Amino acid sequence: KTYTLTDYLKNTYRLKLYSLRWISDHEYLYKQENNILVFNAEYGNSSVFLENSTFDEFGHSINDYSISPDGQFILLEYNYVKQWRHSYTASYDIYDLNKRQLITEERIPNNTQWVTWSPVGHKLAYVWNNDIYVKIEPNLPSYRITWTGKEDIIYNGITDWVYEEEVFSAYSALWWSPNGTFLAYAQFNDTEVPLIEYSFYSDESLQYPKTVRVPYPKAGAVNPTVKFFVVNTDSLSSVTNATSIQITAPASMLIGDHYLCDVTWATQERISLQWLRRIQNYSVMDICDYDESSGRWNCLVARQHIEMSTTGWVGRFRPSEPHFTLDGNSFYKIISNEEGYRHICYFQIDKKDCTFITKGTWEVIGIEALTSDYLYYISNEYKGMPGGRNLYKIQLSDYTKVTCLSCELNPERCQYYSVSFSKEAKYYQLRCSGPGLPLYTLHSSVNDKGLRVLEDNSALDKMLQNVQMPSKKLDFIILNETKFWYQMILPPHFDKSKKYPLLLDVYAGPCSQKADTVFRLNWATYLASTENIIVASFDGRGSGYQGDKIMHAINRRLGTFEVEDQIEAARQFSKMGFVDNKRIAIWGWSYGGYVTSMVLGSGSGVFKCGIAVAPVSRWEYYDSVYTERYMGLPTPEDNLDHYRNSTVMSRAENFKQVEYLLIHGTADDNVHFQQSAQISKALVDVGVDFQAMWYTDEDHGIASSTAHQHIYTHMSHFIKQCFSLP
Amino acid sequence: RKTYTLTDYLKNTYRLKLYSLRWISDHEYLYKQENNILVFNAEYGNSSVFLENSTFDEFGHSINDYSISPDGQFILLEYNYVKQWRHSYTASYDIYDLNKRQLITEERIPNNTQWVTWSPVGHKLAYVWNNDIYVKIEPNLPSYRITWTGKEDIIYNGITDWVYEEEVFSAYSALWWSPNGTFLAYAQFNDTEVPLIEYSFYSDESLQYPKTVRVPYPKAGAVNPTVKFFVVNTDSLSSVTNATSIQITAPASMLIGDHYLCDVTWATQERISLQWLRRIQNYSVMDICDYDESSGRWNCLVARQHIEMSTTGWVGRFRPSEPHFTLDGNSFYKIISNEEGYRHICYFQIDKKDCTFITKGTWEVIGIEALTSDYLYYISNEYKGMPGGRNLYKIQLSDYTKVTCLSCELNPERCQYYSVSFSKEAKYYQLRCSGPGLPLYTLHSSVNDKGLRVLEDNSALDKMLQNVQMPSKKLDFIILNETKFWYQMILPPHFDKSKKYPLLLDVYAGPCSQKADTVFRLNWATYLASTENIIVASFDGRGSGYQGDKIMHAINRRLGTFEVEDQIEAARQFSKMGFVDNKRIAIWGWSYGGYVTSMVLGSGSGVFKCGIAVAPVSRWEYYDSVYTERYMGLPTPEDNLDHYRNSTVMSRAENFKQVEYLLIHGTADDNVHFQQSAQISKALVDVGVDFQAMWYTDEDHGIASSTAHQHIYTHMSHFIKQCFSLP
Amino acid sequence: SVMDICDYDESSGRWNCLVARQHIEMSTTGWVGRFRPSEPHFTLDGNSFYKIISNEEGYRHICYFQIDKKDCTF
Numbered sequence A: 001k002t003y004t005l006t007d008y009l010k011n012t013y014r015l016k017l018y019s020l021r022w023i024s025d026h027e028y029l030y031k032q033e034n035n036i037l038v039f040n041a042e043y044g045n046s047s048v049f050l051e052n053s054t055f056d057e058f059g060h061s062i063n064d065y066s067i068s069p070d071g072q073f074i075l076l077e078y079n080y081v082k083q084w085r086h087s088y089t090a091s092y093d094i095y096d097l098n099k100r101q102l103i104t105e106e107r108i109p110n111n112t113q114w115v116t117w118s119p120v121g122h123k124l125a126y127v128w129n130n131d132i133y134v135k136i137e138p139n140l141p142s143y144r145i146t147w148t149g150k151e152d153i154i155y156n157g158i159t160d161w162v163y164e165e166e167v168f169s170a171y172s173a174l175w176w177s178p179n180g181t182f183l184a185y186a187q188f189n190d191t192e193v194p195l196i197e198y199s200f201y202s203d204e205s206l207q208y209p210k211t212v213r214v215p216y217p218k219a220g221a222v223n224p225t226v227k228f229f230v231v232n233t234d235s236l237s238s239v240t241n242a243t244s245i246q247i248t249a250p251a252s253m254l255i256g257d258h259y260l261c262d263v264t265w266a267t268q269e270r271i272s273l274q275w276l277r278r279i280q281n282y283s284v285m286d287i288c289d290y291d292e293s294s295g296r297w298n299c300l301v302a303r304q305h306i307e308m309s310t311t312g313w314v315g316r317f318r319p320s321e322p323h324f325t326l327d328g329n330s331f332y333k334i335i336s337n338e339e340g341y342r343h344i345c346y347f348q349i350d351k352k353d354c355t356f357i358t359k360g361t362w363e364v365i366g367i368e369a370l371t372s373d374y375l376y377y378i379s380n381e382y383k384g385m386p387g388g389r390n391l392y393k394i395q396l397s398d399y400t401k402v403t404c405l406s407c408e409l410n411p412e413r414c415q416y417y418s419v420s421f422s423k424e425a426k427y428y429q430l431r432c433s434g435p436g437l438p439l440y441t442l443h444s445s446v447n448d449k450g451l452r453v454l455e456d457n458s459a460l461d462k463m464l465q466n467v468q469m470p471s472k473k474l475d476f477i478i479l480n481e482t483k484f485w486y487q488m489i490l491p492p493h494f495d496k497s498k499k500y501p502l503l504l505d506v507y508a509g510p511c512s513q514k515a516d517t518v519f520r521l522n523w524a525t526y527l528a529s530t531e532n533i534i535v536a537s538f539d540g541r542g543s544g545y546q547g548d549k550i551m552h553a554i555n556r557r558l559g560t561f562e563v564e565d566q567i568e569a570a571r572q573f574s575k576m577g578f579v580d581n582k583r584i585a586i587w588g589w590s591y592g593g594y595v596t597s598m599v600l601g602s603g604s605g606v607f608k609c610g611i612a613v614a615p616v617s618r619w620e621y622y623d624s625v626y627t628e629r630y631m632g633l634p635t636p637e638d639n640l641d642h643y644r645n646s647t648v649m650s651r652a653e654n655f656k657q658v659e660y661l662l663i664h665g666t667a668d669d670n671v672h673f674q675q676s677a678q679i680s681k682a683l684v685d686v687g688v689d690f691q692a693m694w695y696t697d698e699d700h701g702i703a704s705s706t707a708h709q710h711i712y713t714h715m716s717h718f719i720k721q722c723f724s725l726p
Numbered sequence B: 001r002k003t004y005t006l007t008d009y010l011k012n013t014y015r016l017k018l019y020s021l022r023w024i025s026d027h028e029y030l031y032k033q034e035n036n037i038l039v040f041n042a043e044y045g046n047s048s049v050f051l052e053n054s055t056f057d058e059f060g061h062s063i064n065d066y067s068i069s070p071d072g073q074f075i076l077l078e079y080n081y082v083k084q085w086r087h088s089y090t091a092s093y094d095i096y097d098l099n100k101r102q103l104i105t106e107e108r109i110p111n112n113t114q115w116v117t118w119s120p121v122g123h124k125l126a127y128v129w130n131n132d133i134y135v136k137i138e139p140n141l142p143s144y145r146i147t148w149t150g151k152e153d154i155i156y157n158g159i160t161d162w163v164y165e166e167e168v169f170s171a172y173s174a175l176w177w178s179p180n181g182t183f184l185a186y187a188q189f190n191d192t193e194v195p196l197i198e199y200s201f202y203s204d205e206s207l208q209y210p211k212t213v214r215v216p217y218p219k220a221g222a223v224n225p226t227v228k229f230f231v232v233n234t235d236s237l238s239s240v241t242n243a244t245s246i247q248i249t250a251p252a253s254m255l256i257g258d259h260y261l262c263d264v265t266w267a268t269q270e271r272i273s274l275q276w277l278r279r280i281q282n283y284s285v286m287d288i289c290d291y292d293e294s295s296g297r298w299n300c301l302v303a304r305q306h307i308e309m310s311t312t313g314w315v316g317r318f319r320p321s322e323p324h325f326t327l328d329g330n331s332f333y334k335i336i337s338n339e340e341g342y343r344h345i346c347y348f349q350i351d352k353k354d355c356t357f358i359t360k361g362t363w364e365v366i367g368i369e370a371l372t373s374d375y376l377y378y379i380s381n382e383y384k385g386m387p388g389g390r391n392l393y394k395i396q397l398s399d400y401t402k403v404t405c406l407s408c409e410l411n412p413e414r415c416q417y418y419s420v421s422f423s424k425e426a427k428y429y430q431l432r433c434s435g436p437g438l439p440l441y442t443l444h445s446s447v448n449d450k451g452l453r454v455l456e457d458n459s460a461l462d463k464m465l466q467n468v469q470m471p472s473k474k475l476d477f478i479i480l481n482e483t484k485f486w487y488q489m490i491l492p493p494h495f496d497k498s499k500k501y502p503l504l505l506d507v508y509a510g511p512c513s514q515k516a517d518t519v520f521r522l523n524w525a526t527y528l529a530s531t532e533n534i535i536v537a538s539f540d541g542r543g544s545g546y547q548g549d550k551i552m553h554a555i556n557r558r559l560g561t562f563e564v565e566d567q568i569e570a571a572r573q574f575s576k577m578g579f580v581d582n583k584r585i586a587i588w589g590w591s592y593g594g595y596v597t598s599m600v601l602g603s604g605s606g607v608f609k610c611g612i613a614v615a616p617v618s619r620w621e622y623y624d625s626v627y628t629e630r631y632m633g634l635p636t637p638e639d640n641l642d643h644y645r646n647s648t649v650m651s652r653a654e655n656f657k658q659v660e661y662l663l664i665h666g667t668a669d670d671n672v673h674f675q676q677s678a679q680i681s682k683a684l685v686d687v688g689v690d691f692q693a694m695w696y697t698d699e700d701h702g703i704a705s706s707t708a709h710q711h712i713y714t715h716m717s718h719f720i721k722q723c724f725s726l727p
Numbered sequence C: 001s002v003m004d005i006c007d008y009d010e011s012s013g014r015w016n017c018l019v020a021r022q023h024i025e026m027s028t029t030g031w032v033g034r035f036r037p038s039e040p041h042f043t044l045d046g047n048s049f050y051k052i053i054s055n056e057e058g059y060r061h062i063c064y065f066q067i068d069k070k071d072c073t074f
């Protein structure tokens, strides 16, 4: 038997996880059953901590919970209503975590946007109607920090649509000081930001469709503006409104449109801020000390470090974050070296030049932990594979003596790692993501030895024994003296003397990686296991984790090299002799939707057919922060010419050679239906037949249980027919 | 050799020729030739060139349409045509003088003018601009502002709001001149509490943010626009003072709740008839209103009121029918359902309560086309007992039993569908013939009744078409409970009853619909029948029109029931007929038809393999109030909510697992909103049924754009071909 | 009246006057200046300037301004 569509859609063969949240440097929590238990590692044992049926009589079903770092209060989250990718709305209730009695008075209000404990003690910070509130005790009246909060126009301590999606990847824009004395926050001003407007059809009982109006800056439009503040949570009278000390952006930033792109505390009294110019090739970091006598914040002009880029933009998606030594007089941050590669720099607060603590033809992925002895980080060095993740440990006292940690713990099963550290890194967890079944293991960083297996996924392993699973290749091809990596999802009982159809699974967007060592049970698994379709993905120009030379390649030049490199990919695959040339398809979601569209638009005649889900159609339609990073401004004096040369509409005439499926959710707040509306219109006008599917009230995820089920069924029907599959 | 292909249909290969004339006097009409516009003498035809097409080019715009003043002195010129809804649009206007030689330059008609009309004699103008009414006594003089209240999307003076345009007046105009252009009567519509349908218009790829279009549109049960009525006196317009308009208020029984103004007809120089309709559309009232000098006001005497009601259904076919006053205005004729339920001509006296019927029978009068003093002229489907035929009749007024069929016999093989254009006092008439053969336009005298000349016999079209293998049309009936129900079939050429043909059921099936008729058409079906060998059939079952009230009011308060079942029963009778492949029977429709199709596909009947729904209604709460409520009453617990509730297509989603479905809809459909199809797709996704969708960006209800018209038919053609396993 | 202080940004090529370097001069008893606001005399480094302004007794005296501080000293 094979891994069917219903198997993927009903999640029969489930990957097991080990999610743990460290309350301390010793103990973590795990939902094992329905209820929460406290685990250790010092003698190794564990005990039952609390039940989801200690709050059975609560009345509601809790969406999430939160522990107050001191361990005295639990914060229960229910009435969850989703907004965008991260933003949402909930009701919150607090318990005296000891007595497990509900805190009855001064309750946190319904319709709260964000809530967060101080890193120590049990202070609260919440956002409600775009305003910031603070609760020193979970049973005392809140202290109202901001008063400017206005729906859709002024966000205090939460992000607007674009800062949520592209800049912070979070709703909240609040940052407590290490020891909970100071609360920093951003305030976003959407006043002149244009609204995207779209209909929401709602339940069928809704007679007249609603119009949703999100302030959303499309490429070139009036962006939001941002101010930054710090407030002292201790000294906080009720007799007088709380005064909030502003920190303005540096001069070189105030001179034109800009973004606040990083917030990192250093000590109780030191905060660091990274600002980005709207043209995202220049970025500045301010370090700001508190003044005990002023009550104010001073960022020294000489202390300003600058992150520049003349080959492309800055960062991978945003400038990298700093990690501060305990004294706060020094920090490490991942940056690009003189020849492309992204490595860790040791900055001395009181000067300009870092020195690189790493070098070579491989990028560092992220800094995971810092002690005053070593520095822990993830990279793709092992076996010079960019699609692999391994955990490394570098000695601060000697930068040349770098010991690996994960790489060889299990080489065959495990080439892709992530790590969750304890509260001071006395222990750490390893998520192995593949290419074998995910493996979760608890280690001690004391003597770097392994403690125990947390999840070896043998349960899933056992019921995958009588399934004919797809296999997976992961290898490079050389193009113009460059290693370009691809992956293949090969059908079981693969026979390279046979000719298999192929689906090119494309994302291809800036700094992407579709060819990795990650193990996945997805739609491609069904396609190979059942339909005997090879599913392949190729990391061409503009993909990530290979240096600035490959990644910046598409700078100001989207819809070119990454599009062209996807076609060349197929040519290479087919010319490996196991591919039916006559049956090659292409598909992608979001950016990949755009690339698929572009390829089917290119007229190369490699591709028989293709699917594009929520594609971009022309870059002016997508949002400023993302689009402008790689494209610039759509003005005649910048890149308006190329914005025009990259629209899918302009290639409508070419879709006559291909069978095409275009799918889009009508309530897609991210990639707007508009984009697909313009593709279809463009196609109609040249007289090309294609398939279409809108999804009423689905967003960019098309993630409703029933919609998800439907879109994959539909696409399966499409691909099979295109492929003459019975 | 060859057949009627898709490109044929789509590229308009075999054109159909019309003869679009405009009467101007009693003996003369206008036609266009080399683009040159000529006047013809009906008696002789010694036709001279009226206005050669070289006069308007250096003038430098696009002459979309034109209009002569009735006295013949001035030509109105329409340009910058920008469409609103079905009828409503906006344009710039220049006036051209024949006598003074050149065009007018001073006090010019505004850009963005909503509507323009001449007085019925002379050369007065009345126009609406920015929802307000203006009058030009002389094309060159300043205009007198009649109304100061008009506010965009809210107060509509002399033009209709969305619903009144589509549903009541089938016009953008709410202006009616008195016969000799002395009085200007108008309606004012208020949409203050009318909710707005809102939808994205996407425009050119150059528009960065989609525009939200917003339109006052009462859905079933929603707050309706209100209506007031006025008459102004144009001869007594003062420059020094604001012109006063006299309000005629609706009768007591109408103000007692929501209502509509449905009809406006001037009777005489100083007499107007107004028909009002209750919101529950089974009770309507006609007011005859006379001017009174010594008061200045208008009086509609209670004793001259005329109630027109229905207990089986609604009043009228779609609206109460219009009066036809005798020259002296003391009497009128109108089509009303009789005691048998058949629509016939009733003769009414202003100063009396009962009418007397002057036609009767098991058939219906379609329209009163002319009324002289010797003859009533009317179109009916009496001939041969074919409800799908239309012929011309004259009633000898002096003895209404003496009736003559003017068109029946002229050419009974070629011609059984007719319409008529009468000259101003009916001295002459154009007869248009629309089927079953090729269209035929003929010009006639009323005195002798002799045919004068063939204006257009489509021989040009006949020439090419005898090389093409064309489908026949069979028009017949089947008997269901000793009731005849008619169908038509577009039969592939060389049709063989030994063979089993795939069948496509072409469905409208709205109230008072008629899909089975004698009209000749060149459509998508002509292609399916000729090229693909699909039998396409249509069937007029219960709810359908021109066959009496018993059949038409059968769906009263019960939409999405009998008209749906009768479509299913049709196909059954069509299989049972012996020349139909059971395994290949599809169904498709547009508007109401799209609703029926969807309702049939979800039926569980299992008769139908696959179906196509274009811009369907999904549930009746989504459609406009005056159409829907005519048939459904209000969606309330007190009226007809349960049935609104049972008659949605969404509640049948589960059953779509049984058919192959294609659901198509334009996004800028202001009529049946894209909403309706959004809710269908969503209901289908929710029960895990696979269907096919196609949205059309910025298209409206007609999906009428050149390229979008071609696209949708090509798309449908592929769906049908696959469903029927055609290569 | 408002004194803007504008710097040439090298990478830009453009000129920029930061709002925090804006200096306001106004009068409640009449017009600002003798016939126009007074001209600034900058110290060599550009960071400071002297200016004749009316003092709180309506007497025109030399005030010492810092580019960043709103308030001067006479």
Ligand SMILES: *[C@@H]1O[C@H](CO)[C@@H](O[C@@H]2O[C@H](CO)[C@@H](O[C@@H]3O[C@H](CO)[C@@H](O)[C@H](O)[C@H]3NC(C)=O)[C@H](O)[C@H]2NC(C)=O)[C@H](O)[C@H]1NC(C)=O
Pocket (backbone or CB within 6 Å): A148, A154, A189, A190, A191, A192
């Ligand atoms: C978010 O940004 C908005 C600008 O996009 C800010 O709104 C501006 O603030 C000004 C002061 O409140 C407005 O009015 C000015 O008021 C002064 C008072 O003395 C008058 O002299 C000015 O003539 C007057 N300006 C005008 C043109 O009326 C601005 O008009 C106003 N701009 C807007 C709303 O578009 C918001 O205050 C800001 N919010 C926060 C808290 O940062």
Ligand SMILES: *[C@@H]1O[C@H](CO)[C@@H](O[C@@H]2O[C@H](CO)[C@@H](O)[C@H](O)[C@H]2NC(C)=O)[C@H](O)[C@H]1NC(C)=O
Pocket (backbone or CB within 6 Å): B149, B155, B190, B191, B192, B193
């Ligand atoms: C259009 O209709 C509205 C009612 O929907 C009328 O507005 C009312 O005006 C009267 C004044 O006599 C007020 O008492 C009401 O409060 C108003 N209603 C609302 C909610 O606006 C208005 O009179 C109508 N306009 C015209 C031209 O007749």
Ligand SMILES: CCc1nc(CC(C)(C)C)c(CN)c(-c2ccc(C)cc2)c1CC(=O)O
Pocket (backbone or CB within 6 Å): A165, A166, A167, A169, A317, A509, A589, A590, A591, A616, A622, A626, A670, A671, A700
């Ligand atoms: C991890 C998924 C993701 N995350 C992000 C946000 C970060 C880049 C910060 C991570 C973005 C940027 N909006 C996208 C994205 C969306 C649309 C397009 C045209 C391009 C990129 C995606 C892809 C997706 O939503 O499917």
Ligand SMILES: CCc1nc(CC(C)(C)C)c(CN)c(-c2ccc(C)cc2)c1CC(=O)O
Pocket (backbone or CB within 6 Å): B166, B167, B168, B170, B318, B510, B590, B591, B592, B617, B623, B627, B671, B672, B701
């Ligand atoms: C002849 C065209 C037409 N004219 C009219 C207007 C009158 C009935 C007054 C004549 C209407 C009524 N809105 C419709 C119609 C539209 C939608 C629906 C659900 C039902 C009926 C159509 C059908 C169409 O638009 O194709």
Ligand SMILES: *[C@@H]1O[C@H](CO)[C@@H](O)[C@H](O)[C@H]1NC(C)=O
Pocket (backbone or CB within 6 Å): A107, A108, A109, A110
């Ligand atoms: C929130 O929900 C409802 C208000 O409709 C009410 O029963 C309850 O008191 C509210 N609770 C809080 C925490 O304010």
Ligand SMILES: *[C@@H]1O[C@H](CO)[C@@H](O)[C@H](O)[C@H]1NC(C)=O
Pocket (backbone or CB within 6 Å): A147, A238, A239, A240, A241
């Ligand atoms: C705080 O500020 C707001 C408006 O700025 C004001 O209305 C309110 O009274 C103030 N509250 C206190 C306690 O001063």
Ligand SMILES: *[C@@H]1O[C@H](CO)[C@@H](O)[C@H](O)[C@H]1NC(C)=O
Pocket (backbone or CB within 6 Å): B092, B108, B109, B110, B111
């Ligand atoms: C209408 O439009 C044209 C072109 O903009 C212009 O010549 C004319 O003066 C405008 N207005 C009037 C009053 O017709």
Ligand SMILES: *[C@@H]1O[C@H](CO)[C@@H](O)[C@H](O)[C@H]1NC(C)=O
Pocket (backbone or CB within 6 Å): B148, B240, B241, B242
């Ligand atoms: C007529 O009425 C309008 C609006 O009521 C008023 O403003 C105006 O004074 C009058 N028009 C003239 C010019 O007499």
Ligand SMILES: *[C@@H]1O[C@H](CO)[C@@H](O)[C@H](O)[C@H]1NC(C)=O
Pocket (backbone or CB within 6 Å): B180, B182, B269, B270
């Ligand atoms: C038009 O009709 C009105 C009202 O009957 C009357 O005053 C006038 O005589 C008529 N004018 C002409 C020219 O017929």
Ligand SMILES: *[C@@H]1O[C@H](CO)[C@@H](O)[C@H](O)[C@H]1NC(C)=O
Pocket (backbone or CB within 6 Å): B480, B481, B483, B542
């Ligand atoms: C008989 O009456 C009608 C005739 O119009 C027919 O369509 C229907 O099937 C029958 N009715 C019932 C309920 O038997």
Ligand SMILES: *[C@@H]1O[C@H](CO)[C@@H](O)[C@H](O)[C@H]1NC(C)=O
Pocket (backbone or CB within 6 Å): A279, A281, A282, A310, C011, C012
């Ligand atoms: C960033 O990009 C621009 C546009 O290509 C380029 O001219 C320059 O290198 C950078 N601009 C600035 C102001 O730093």
Ligand SMILES: *[C@@H]1O[C@H](CO)[C@@H](O)[C@H](O)[C@H]1NC(C)=O
Pocket (backbone or CB within 6 Å): C026, C027, C028
């Ligand atoms: C400037 O003058 C105006 C008008 O005389 C007056 O309202 C105001 O007092 C003055 N403003 C200032 C800033 O003194």
